[PDB]
């Protein structure tokens with residue numbers, strides 16, 4: 002269950018998540034747009050799902066993409082702040098899961114975000130250990146998809 | 147015009163928003179649910195829009211309502227964090243505006259949140275001065291609906 006996935010996040014994993022978020026989460030506009038643009042560059046097949054945002058190749062200049070990207074970073078902020086209470090983490094994860102279930106986004110497709118996250122982390126010198134920690138958090142969401 | 151509305155957030159207003167947010171934003175789960183339950187109690191006619199959340203009278207016990215409520219508080223956190231840059235404030239406001247336009251929520255009905263905000267603020271010893279400051283921020287979202 003989603004609870005099982007959340008309940009399994011260990012102290013060391015939460016530590017790595019918080020330490021890396023202190024940095025990547027400090028510039029939500031910049032890193033949020035970077036995450037989205039990287040997803041579009043490496044997984045062009047996903048561009049079609051974001052038609053509401055218009056021309057995503059416009060990057061930072063695209064106000065709709067900018068607003069969406071900042072919002073995405075606050076969903077992550079939410080997750081990070083709820084790490085110590087699985088009950089709360091689960092209810093927020095299920096909420097955002099619905100936002101994607103309605104768009105027909107499968108657990109496998111949601112996992113495509115791992116590549117971009119790994120790259121953004123690396124740009125700030127956070128290695129594989131950190132990317133693995135984030136993959137575990139993403140897996141919590143996948144448990145609800 | 148959302149841009150003219152955003153221009154109404156003067157130095158004094160921004161200060162009052164930040165000062166009060168430091169207090170109300172410290173307990174997103176508690177105050178978020180308080181905001182929603184107050185809305186449903188004072189404006190019963192809005193409950194119909196929240197069909198997906200199930201029995202909202204259950205309050206904190208309702209997992210869907212708690213998840214929704216926490217999310218709402220992070221939307222407000224987002225707004226507060228963008229007060230420095232009007233261009234970014236507008237793009238995030240328009241993003242959440244879409245979320246409500248799709249639910250057929252008008253500017254007038256969105257404004258029904260002012261009562262709840264004033265009540266929650268009052269319970270924390272923040273009077274009309276602060277309630278009026280928040281009404282100006284809510285007005286920016288209303289201009290986009």
Ligand code: HEM
Nearest residue numbers: 047050051053072073076077100104106110111113114245
């Ligand atoms: C770290 C992972 C991710 C997070 C935290 C996240 C968060 C969000 C948030 C907060 C929204 C806005 C929900 C709404 O207002 O309706 C959203 C929308 C959306 N997400 Fe994600 N998302 C993630 C990964 C993905 C991935 C990998 C895909 C695609 C393969 C995806 C596809 C979508 C789509 C299509 C929308 C709708 C955009 C629109 O039309 O406005 N998301 N996401």
Ligand code: HEM
Nearest residue numbers: 100192195196198217218221222245249251255256258259
């Ligand atoms: C401070 C004011 C408010 C903020 C910041 C706010 C924020 C939000 C957020 C972030 C969502 C989730 C969007 C999504 O995932 O689709 C949401 C959903 C919603 N909001 Fe608001 N909202 C506010 C006031 C209101 C008011 C006053 C009404 C109704 C009179 C309203 C009606 C709705 C409805 C119907 C939903 C959909 C809930 C669901 O089915 O999940 N909102 N709101």
